[PDB]
Amino acid sequence: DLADRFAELERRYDARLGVYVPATGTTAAIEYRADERFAFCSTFKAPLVAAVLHQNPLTHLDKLITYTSDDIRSISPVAQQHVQTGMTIGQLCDAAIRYSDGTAANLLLADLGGPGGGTAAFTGYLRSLGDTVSRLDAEAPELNRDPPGDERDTTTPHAIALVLQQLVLGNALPPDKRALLTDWMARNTTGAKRIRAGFPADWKVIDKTGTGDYGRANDIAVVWSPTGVPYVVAVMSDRAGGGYDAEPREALLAEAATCVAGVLA
Numbered sequence: 001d002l003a004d005r006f007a008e009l010e011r012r013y014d015a016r017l018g019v020y021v022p023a024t025g026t027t028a029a030i031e032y033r034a035d036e037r038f039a040f041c042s043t044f045k046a047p048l049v050a051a052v053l054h055q056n057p058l059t060h061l062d063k064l065i066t067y068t069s070d071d072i073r074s075i076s077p078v079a080q081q082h083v084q085t086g087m088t089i090g091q092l093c094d095a096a097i098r099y100s101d102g103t104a105a106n107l108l109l110a111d112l113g114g115p116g117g118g119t120a121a122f123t124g125y126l127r128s129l130g131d132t133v134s135r136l137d138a139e140a141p142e143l144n145r146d147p148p149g150d151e152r153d154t155t156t157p158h159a160i161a162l163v164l165q166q167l168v169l170g171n172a173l174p175p176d177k178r179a180l181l182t183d184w185m186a187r188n189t190t191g192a193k194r195i196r197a198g199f200p201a202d203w204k205v206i207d208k209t210g211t212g213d214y215g216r217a218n219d220i221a222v223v224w225s226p227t228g229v230p231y232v233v234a235v236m237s238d239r240a241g242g243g244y245d246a247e248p249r250e251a252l253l254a255e256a257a258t259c260v261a262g263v264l265a
């Protein structure tokens, strides 16, 4: 029944949709193509910032990172404007989450160490949380310039939602670090037309979005009902038949979020 509605959405948008909301004490898990792989795009930036927080002392946030104009490979609304000053690990965190800054992310990986510019260390951090499915192989970008059917740089709605659940609602991070991550996602500036648009205004929403080629659009959120009940919502889509230059349908993610809201309501 729910599946049928999701399918209609799939038809209505010429897209592939993947949805997952973890089960709770009173609601069954919601799932559509929950175990199929979808490109991370920038959604990794969120558990990345938790990788960075887990590993180091709070104090580490103040550490200044220096980079050059050639380090700027991808959309960098913030890092582009600070080549002269550089940014603390804290300002990098903030921008990788709230503005989806491609360079801020590229830096924070590095700051994680080891082969793959940091991607092994990052996939290392996912594993540590029980996620054996997801994998980040490449750096920003290219991460969103893979072919449909390529398993590098992918995750599932299932896998990312359980991760996000531990970060924000669970015990993955000490409380101090927990509120840093959560507060940064609550003030995300890139998601107003996604999960957040599909839910009544009186539900609180935090999230981190992802966008890529082949009409890739993702959104991962934690929502709070008017009464304070939290749920984790993972919504992912691509439109492979439109090819590389296919356009991401944001209204797909907003609608699927409305279907989800009605079922949680």
Ligand SMILES: *C(=O)[C@](NC(=O)c1ccccc1)(OC)[C@@H]1N=C(C(=O)O)C(=C)CS1
Pocket (backbone or CB within 6 Å): 040, 041, 042, 043, 074, 075, 099, 100, 101, 102, 140, 141, 144, 190, 208, 209, 210, 211, 212, 213
């Ligand atoms: C996230 O994926 C992001 N953008 C891209 O990767 C990207 C988008 C479009 C074309 C090429 C690459 O950086 C990885 C940032 N996040 C968003 C977002 O909506 O959350 C973007 C829309 C683009 S920048």
